[PDB]
Amino acid sequence: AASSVDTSQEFQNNLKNAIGNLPFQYVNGIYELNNNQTNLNADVNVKAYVQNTIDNQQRPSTANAMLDRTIRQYQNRRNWKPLGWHQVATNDHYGHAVDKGALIAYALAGNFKGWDASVSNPQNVVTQTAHSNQSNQKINRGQNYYESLVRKAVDQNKRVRYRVTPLYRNDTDLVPFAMHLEAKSQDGTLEFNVAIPNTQASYTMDYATGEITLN
Ligand SMILES: [Cl-]
Ligand SMILES: [Cl-]
Fold this sequence. Notes:
Layout: H1 9-19, E1 24-27, E2 30-33, E3 49-51, E4 63-67, E5 98-102, H2 106-109, E6 125-129, H3 130-134, H4 143-155, E7 160-167, E8 178-185, E9 191-197, E10 203-206, E11 211-214
Antiparallel strand pairs: 1-2, 2-9, 3-4, 4-7, 5-6, 7-8, 8-9, 10-11
The structure holds chloride ion (2 copies).
One chloride ion (CL) binds at residues 131, 200-201.
């Protein structure tokens, strides 16, 4: 249970195992890693792209992108469930426990030629808590908050190198315990390195199976 409480020692141990001996601190509901510095190189003369990948257990793994206005998607799109999916009606304001969580957001890369930008791209979607997927607030941050930073940067004509990595406790868990987001703009004005805990205050999750126990 403790592994799905974002502030617990157990969670932090898993985080350390997944990212190495990088410094981290809890702030605004997330973990800032390595003083918010990433080694991503945005100063590369390469065409915008997205690359999704999977690991040896067929789980969504490291995703990379170079983002700019050529693949930005402002428009709307014109049964499948991710690994570990077990929906539960919660006792919190979200109403439900989990969302199909994209590694690389539709709005960011939906215009990239040939790419499966759908909600059922099996290399780009995980079981993600509603809280950690949806929260767009600076005070209590979710993945949406960081996606908004990247989106706003691209909308200001910035080139953003971006890397999103689901963090798993071990080789077999179906559901990641956190989402690692890294971003760097060519001009250096945008840079972050964070882990968004795959947690929700009103319940705990067994990351092995995705089974949720409401508080
Ligand atoms: Cl830039
Ligand atoms: Cl929450």
